Amino acid sequence: DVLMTQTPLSLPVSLGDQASISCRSSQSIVHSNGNTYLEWYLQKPGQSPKLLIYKVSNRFSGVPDRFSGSGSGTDFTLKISRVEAEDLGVYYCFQGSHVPWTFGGGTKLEIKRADAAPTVSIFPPSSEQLTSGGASVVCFLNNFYPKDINVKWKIDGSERQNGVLNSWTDQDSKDSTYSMSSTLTLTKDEYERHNSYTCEATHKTSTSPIVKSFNRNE
Amino acid sequence: VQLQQSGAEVMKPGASVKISCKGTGYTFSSYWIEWVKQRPGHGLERIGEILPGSGSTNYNEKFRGKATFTADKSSKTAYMQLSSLTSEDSAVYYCARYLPYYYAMDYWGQGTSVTVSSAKTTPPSVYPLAPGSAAQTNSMVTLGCLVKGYFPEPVTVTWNSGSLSSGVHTFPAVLQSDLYTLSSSVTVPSSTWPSETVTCNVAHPASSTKVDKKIVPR
Ligand SMILES: *[C@@H]1O[C@H](CO)[C@@H](O[C@@H]2O[C@H](CO)[C@@H](O[C@@H]3O[C@H](CO)[C@@H](O)[C@H](O)[C@@H]3O)[C@H](O)[C@H]2NC(C)=O)[C@H](O)[C@H]1NC(C)=O
Incomplete structure (x- = not known):
């Protein structure tokens, strides 16, 4: 199967900036009829893909003129004259030349803006957790940018890597910042044994990791 | 033109699911039906294609034997059967209308979500x-x-x-x-x-x- 590769994996570009997505093929995908069949598809979150370009350059009906394509035997690129809110999504290159036909790796498109420092927070368990016989420790990080975020679960001088949940949120619209909620599930037999719980998070904006902790002993 | 997919499915590991794509408003038997898998993480992976008019079918190397395509001409519907469902098979599956070399995937199904869990x-x-x-x-x-x-x-x-x-x-x-x-x-x-x-x-x-x-x- 012809292998098709997309670069970059992510393409942060602010509004109105030129956007360039490149797609390459493991083999030439030209055809005898004078055309090479390459199409570009765009998928918004929680929606089915949509056709943008086909046969490399030919533009689909009903799509803005800003989109354009170009390429040759094994190198192709997509161009957006101006970026807008609707333009946000994932872009795939599709080759329709050699059976079987394969999709590109996907090139997520993003809008860069003034990076904001993360607002870290830590929430200990609740009475319901104690009654149920469990202890859930969750760390919150809201309105941060860019994806240069790392969270370390250091507890009373001990770094614990087991049972760590990685769940971040895609960029929003109003704020265009991400979020990152990490959780650590603790049992009652183990929850009370330790004394200090801390959530170390490091971000590009603040070189020194931000520290938020609470002590069980109180 | 409209491709209508079946509802969401939840099935146990090792079982087999059969999802259907119904096309109306065009010559159903003269358009290839393309099946695409989108794992929740990332990426579009084409499973294969079937031409309802004939029995011709193609599969990508990664899915040969995992998926089987069948089509009913009387009722304008196409079926994909997944066998030996593992946890990886959980994803959203799309059906698209395609005519090689002439028309791209201009119409897509709403997307069918399959979840494999015990x-x-x-x-x-x-x-x-x-x-x-x-x-x-x-x-x-x-x-x-x-x-x-x-x-x-x-x-x-x-x-x-x-x-x-x-x-x-x-x-x-x-x-x-x-x-x-x-x-x-x-x-x-x-x-x-x-x-x-x-x-x-x-x-x-x-x-x-x-x-x-x-x-x-x-
Ligand atoms: C099978 O053979 C036929 C006939 O040789 C091919 O039809 C020809 O296809 C080319 C390329 O699509 C057409 O030229 C193009 O026409 C469009 C629309 O006018 C124009 O925008 C392009 O700039 C280019 O001029 C050509 O008109 C067409 N000829 C006829 C008589 O239909 C067909 O492409 C071949 N198919 C395959 C799969 O090889």
Whole structure:
């Protein structure tokens, strides 16, 4: 199967900036009829893909003129004259030349803006957790940018890597910042044994990791 | 023109599922039906194609033997059968109309979600959380609402009649061991949180479960 590769994996570009997505093929995908069949598809979150370009350059009906394509035997690129809110999504290159036909790796498109420092927070368990016989420790990080975020679960001088949940949120619209909620599930037999719980998070904006902790002993 | 896909499916590991794509408004037998798999993580992977007029079918190397295509000409429907469902097979599957070399994937199905799991329907266990007592109170603070131990998707979280919609940051569900969870935190004035009442609503249509647990200061 012809292998098709997309670069970059992510393409942060602010509004109105030129956007360039490149797609390459493991083999030439030209055809005898004078055309090479390459199409570009765009998928918004929680929606089915949509056709943008086909046969490399030919533009689909009903799509803005800003989109354009170009390429040759094994190198192709997509161009957006101006970026807008609707333009946000994932872009795939599709080759329709050699059976079987394969999709590109996907090139997520993003809008860069003034990076904001993360607002870290830590929430200990609740009475319901104690009654149920469990202890859930969750760390919150809201309105941060860019994806240069790392969270370390250091507890009373001990770094614990087991049972760590990685769940971040895609960029929003109003704020265009991400979020990152990490959780650590603790049992009652183990929850009370330790004394200090801390959530170390490091971000590009603040070189020194931000520290938020609470002590069980109180 | 319109491609209508079947409903969502939840099946146990090792079983086999059969999803259907129904095309109307065009010559169903003269257009290839393309099947695409989108794992929740990332990427579009074409499974294969079938021309309903004939029996011709193609499969990508990764799916040869995993998927089998069948089509009914009398009822304008095409079927894909997945055998030996593992946990990796859980994804959203799309059906698209394609005519090689002439027309691209201009029309797509709504998308069918398949989930492979050993669990059964379970109501959510909403555990509202509040800022820890050992935490300085400042002008702006973050609230806490936690939902866990629920299955399957989805679960909608909202405030009382949309009391505070903007500024909320929900997060995608994740699996601890087998069950899904969810977190949601919002920013409210420090002077309004204790005075005004803030609560997070939970709805689980799959379990027909609705919950409402207000969070009060510790
Ligand atoms: C099978 O053979 C036929 C006939 O040789 C091919 O039809 C020809 O296809 C080319 C390329 O699509 C057409 O030229 C193009 O026409 C469009 C629309 O006018 C124009 O925008 C392009 O700039 C280019 O001029 C050509 O008109 C067409 N000829 C006829 C008689 O239809 C067909 O492409 C071949 N198919 C395959 C799969 O090889």
